[PDB]
Symmetry: D2
Subunit: 476 residues, 4 copies
């Protein structure tokens, strides 16, 4: 009921024979699903060399031929969404419907990059002399190394693959060892779409060892990392020390500003359903809720009522809308957030404890009035917990929204043009969502500021980290 | 007397040393001391960062046309003061007066381009999937910047940092070159005289490693811009990245030149000789490795040596001098070592190759024939008045040799063939490819490198990329 | 005469007077005194202007964009230095208050400086090719000799648009400005002359407007037309230009709707809309004309609007304290009278104004008409004068439908605090420009233009050169 | 299968047979046999199509660009699936060899898919404001109902240009394709219908072309016209459109010059130019027509060109091995005869061809004319047929001046190994498209259009939507 786990190097799958493996466990049952083969150091060298060899011709392939191939892969992902999503549910925990939506979203991302790869436009700059021609070209940088995490194992990786391939680069990818089936399926569908050997390689191992070896590989010219801020800082320093380009999607700590003039009940119902998708294990998860005092009670009552409709359970079961957390350590982490909040006077309005059974189930948790020195209001919980505090002055709430070094997503609800304008300009965040959640579209750029990373994924900006600028000036 | 007072500039006020440590500034052509440069204290640098942050709060919101007017005023003053600023540059850096003045004028054009470009930091409206949704991609100034710029073009390298920071709506703490500082003082003076609000531009001095460490580690500093050597760039980039701070870098190059058999060979040789020995070859884009198609090799060399022979080495303020001394004694030692290494490995020194007489750091224009692939000259950036010229047979082999080094800033090619021009420009791994001329001057084009040569661009439309953050705003109405 | 500058033609770098030419009197609309005689170009003069523009274009198209910019910025600086003198003559031959004429010059200097900057940025595109030996470039190149026609309401800044756009794109220009308010155009020729613009790049001609425009449009060297004026004249000239496959851009009239939502700062909107409306006595292509005020705010808006209108001082444009001058000519006074009578005949109330003022000058009182019906001229035809109509509305979508009912579509205005109202109104309006809570069409860096009968193309902004550049696709296999 | 498909109108999502309407026979140009009867739209049919397109636009303009793209890509996939049948019918009613007809369908599918992608990217601009409380956006919005007219030379892909650009921009369309080769348009209606395109978005009509085009252009709801056809008809339609202030784009005739430099790969150029020239029997808007070959390469080029022309096989377009079919109609045979007669009467040499070929159909021999003078029709009028003129040149600047002498300016071609030649030629040519050493105007991602009499606006590329979008400047103070 769970697919075989493989490596994929230079157009060929590889199994465990002669390799170390690591068990893969279902977070909803704690049972072993399969064993994941680790790349050797030689495997990783072979993958870099194959990616370098593939890049020599792939960079020159027609952008339409490359588009055709990427679209064929996206079509296969859509055909296989139920099977791929089911394995994601098994090795990551999220409800099946969420896993399938992730596959579809990843297919749209891949298709957008196919379209955008035809549009890596250069610029002609009017010259000071009529015998001179000035062009600014954009060209693929070369072999890329990417590392992607477990919270959206299929779509996070698709970002790395879609951006590298559609820009004309090639890629060695180390996806999440703990939720690996999504990555194997990506290799499978790119293989089935006819992607030339070496263009896409997937490897596994001890993450620090794999990432160190990939970053120090001389043929690797650009790194892309999605993960935690402290690991991001370590890999970025190493990459920078070798003058290697990097783009980073790190954690966030999203503030929510609910103005007194908002549709308060509407905001509460939307934010409850959105918060507990993927059990809050979302880089953009709304976490710090600042609700104008006159609306606080109305919002909190509406929020708790909507949270009360959530059904926690095993992700393949009918009607389950929230699964377990990804591992036992996440349960302990939320426990510590809850304990820290209560010690400092906060009220646990609902949830706050683990749920019974084997497997890492935790109740959706709502914390009222957590102070500014609680962990909840400072450290990214990445889990099914929110803090809701009143505010009086909008500028004070904005200053609090900007106090943390995080700056990924942010949210606001208001009917006022002036409020919307002031909030959106004053927020220090890569993304500002007003009255809805609009970060899904592949055609918009997704990225952060401050500790939340560098660069963007999706949109027109998608290839910026993958292309070099070349100024060519010619006198005739 | 003939050299201006050297000062710090913090939060709109100039500071003399008043008890601070100083460092002598030496004229490289006479070795005489010109003046004393005051070092910023740790407290001075903190005050500059805090001043830049207070200034950023309002300057970020100032009208782009008001900011443009002010930056243009500063550029007009630079043009008015070009001779005086240029003379002092010759004195504390070495280059001939005509080059120093041309550097100032070029920096004024760069400043004006940025004034114009600051009005054009356009956002994007992305058509939404629903008619009640508005999707905008905004570009906003990142915040306080720290910049470090070197001595080879002390005025225009620094102007790049100032123009890009200020015109994007950021503010700046700048550490220019202690060994050639008058240009930086003049920059502070003219932005001050143009009425730039206090805190927007601050200039500091000190022990370079200590100052840069403090600036990068200052929490309010959000972005770094460095022009200098590759190893220092790698050290500072690693420090900045560990703090998740954005960086752009203009590092060294090792520019190859491909002279095809079908080129105007004599025209190429004369142009490349005059261009190479500008600033005594102390130029990040300086043509260094000459690959000349075998059949054109002898014709090119004779024409190159004839042109090299017309260069007049002397003191930069003296009439008719077209090459000055090197910037410091250590540069003479460095070129000596390149020459010795080439000779030991069998290369021919066609002209030059020795230091020139006199007090000051004078060195003869040096042309090395047939240096092998393991000579320092063909691997390490000499950044001085020396070239190597080797024959090639197959153009693709020459291109691989051009791309072999981790450097990738400038590159040059001379050909009349449309096919050669296309194949060369596509195959070169370089941020800039110059074909049949030297065209990296215009403020409206992007200047930058690949691989070890750095990342990001200065000038052109790309000038603000490191200074703006992307903000996606999506609103349901 | 003594306080008014000499009127001249300007052809191939030389000024020409009336020797051998027919002339036309130039009249001060505030006094009816004759200011001077305007020389008419002969047919041969116009031929010479077109030939000179063509010879100039041959080299001007290849001049460095930075050299062209330097020159254009010098001309702009001269405009700033001469603003008081140029403005005084504009007031004399056009009628508007001195402060308005000087502000017009300063605005035109900014527009010209913007085009100097934008001329360096007529970027082409490199399109990634299907084969690595192919190079695909999309170039933008100047189209050639342009002919332009600009009106009297902003004689200096409307003409500046034609000159700045043509010159900064690499084109050259034969311009026919307004014979009724001509000194601004002569001053434009003088400052481009003084800045060193090469001969032939800019030529100014005068004459019988229909005859001059016919000859210019039919000149084979002329490749592109640009016209600002009335819709019916634009349609005649556009049809002639199109019959010869010549490119055109057009800035025609508008009939601007204003939507005042109930949640607006009503008093602020009324005060702003009153001062803005009667600038240049409403002789403004974007002039707010049809005011749709949500019923609950109607009385409050009207009371504040009438109060603000009451502070306007009508008089001669050079006199201290005058904030509205006379209309441009006697036929304008007759036209506004006919609007007033037509509204009165159909049941509307004249809340203030509604009559002509004494004196030989073409003075008319600022006029506010309440409740004019859908079949009044005021709610259908562009009045281009000191008159507005104000009606209540209940449902915003009905107001939007009325705002869109006319074939005009230049400017439009709205006042609201609601994000939804602002979004719904801005998307639903059929207009080239939507101003919400303020009047923001001034900046040189934004595109100014209309839809439907109000024309096509834009002036200013990134779009300024679109009508002046041709696309050239170059594809090369190596 | 030798069947020919039913010819129908398509209005508001439903097909119509003739049902007593006037009809017109459709004739196979290779056999002269009647293939079927084409129904003409009545005036009421045309009114209904305009009204249906207007209703449809109300919701189509607000549809998600991704939903619209999905639908257009489904239509493209159906075109690819049906390519053999659609292509066979094109050969039957237009004449071109089957392999050309199929390639036209595939090329049109690529054009449709590109527009699907580009419709997601009709980006607006945010202009940095002078005050922090102001928001300035430049939006691009679909103009409304479009009317389009497309010709017979590429009946499927010319019409696809009109359909793809209108629909993908958010507009709707009433299309009048070529009555003489109508099956391709019916096939287009069928596949957009089969893809689920909402009713009214695409309507196809037929009739007397001047009457249909007059009625569509004068329909009030029609806001924009797009025409591909001849220069004189384009000028007639453009003047009518301009008189009503309606936006227009035009792809008219060309007269392509070819500059063959002495340093070219001459034999490669001759062989490529021969095969490209006689595609669609030269009935191509970009067809290479005037060949200027540097004197030193002239003999080599002509000899190699004649050899390649000699390999062309003329016959019925469905027959095996045929590489050129008949001309589209008898009137084309008369026209080419007149070009040949004028050339010989003025002293040129007919090196090959020059006569009609046997049989009932409009077959004509590939014709190469040597040394036609500047006063021959061949060097001045677009022949649009299987004929070229070849003259030597000595000075490259004189060849460029001759290449630019005509008011035509669509495509142009050059062959050289010199970077200087390529640069000087590509900059000096007055043409919308310059092809150097190959023919590179096929890609959907590049802009296709002309200058001077050859039209204005572009199809394909990023520019594809420029005629279909209005600019809206929104400035909001908060």
């Amino acid at each position: 009921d769970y697919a075989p786990l493989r490596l994929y190097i230079d157009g060929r799958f590889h199994d465990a024979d002669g390799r170390r493996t690591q068990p893969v466990v279902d977070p909803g049952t704690t049972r072993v699903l399969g064993e994941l083969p680790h790349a050797t150091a030689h495997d990783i060298d072979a993958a870099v060399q194959a990616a370098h060899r593939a890049f020599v011709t792939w960079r020159h392939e027609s952008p339409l031929v490359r588009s055709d191939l990427l679209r064929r892969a996206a079509a296969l992902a859509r055909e296989r969404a139920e099977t791929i999503g089911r394995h994601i549910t098994m090795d990551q925990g999220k409800p099946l419907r969420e896993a399938i939506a992730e596959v579809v979203s990843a297919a749209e991302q891949l298709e957008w990059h196919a379209e955008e790869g035809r549009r890596t436009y250069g610029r002609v700059v009017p010259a000071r002399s009529p015998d001179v021609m000035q062009t600014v070209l954009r060209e693929p940088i070369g072999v890329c190394a990417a590392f992607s995490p477990w919270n959206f194992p299929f779509s996070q990786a698709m970002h790395k693959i879609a951006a590298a391939l559609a820009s004309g680069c090639t890629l060695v990818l180390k996806g999440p060892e703990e939720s690996p089936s999504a990555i194997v399926a990506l290799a499978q569908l790119f293989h089935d779409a006819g992607l030339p050997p070496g263009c896409l390689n997937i490897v596994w191992g001890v993450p620090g060892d794999v990432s160190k070896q990939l970053i120090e590989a001389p043929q690797v010219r650009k790194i892309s990392f999605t993960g935690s801020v402290p690991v991001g800082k370590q890999l970025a320093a190493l990459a920078a020390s070798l003058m290697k380009r990097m783009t980073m999607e790190l954690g966030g700590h999203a503030p929510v500003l609910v103005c007194a003039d908002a549709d308060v009940e509407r905001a509460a119902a939307m934010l409850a359903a959105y918060k507990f998708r993927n059990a809050g294990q979302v880089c953009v998860s709304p976490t710090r809720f600042f609700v104008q005092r006159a609306a606080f009670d109305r919002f909190v009552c509406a929020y708790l009522d909507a949270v009360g409709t959530i059904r926690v359970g095993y992700g393949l079961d009918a009607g389950v809308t929230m699964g377990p957390l990804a591992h036992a350590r996440r349960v302990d982490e939320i426990d510590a957030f809850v304990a820290d909040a209560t010690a400092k006077g906060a009220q646990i309005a609902t949830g706050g404890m683990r749920l019974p059974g084997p497997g890492h189930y935790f109740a959706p948790t709502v914390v009222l009035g957590p102070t500014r020195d609680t962990r909840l209001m400072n450290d990214e919980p990445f889990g099914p917990i929110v803090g809701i505090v009143p505010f009086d002055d909008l500028d004070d709430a904005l200053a609090e929204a900007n106090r943390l070094p995080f700056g990924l997503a942010s949210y606001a609800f208001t009917t006022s043009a002036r409020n919307a304008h002031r909030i959106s300009r004053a927020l220090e965040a890569g993304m500002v969502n007003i009255n809805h959640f609009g970060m899904g579209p592949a055609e918009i750029p997704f990225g952060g500021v401050k500790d939340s990373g560098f660069g963007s994924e999706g949109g027109m900006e998608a290839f910026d980290g993958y292309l070099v600028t070349k100024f060519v000036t010619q006198m005739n």
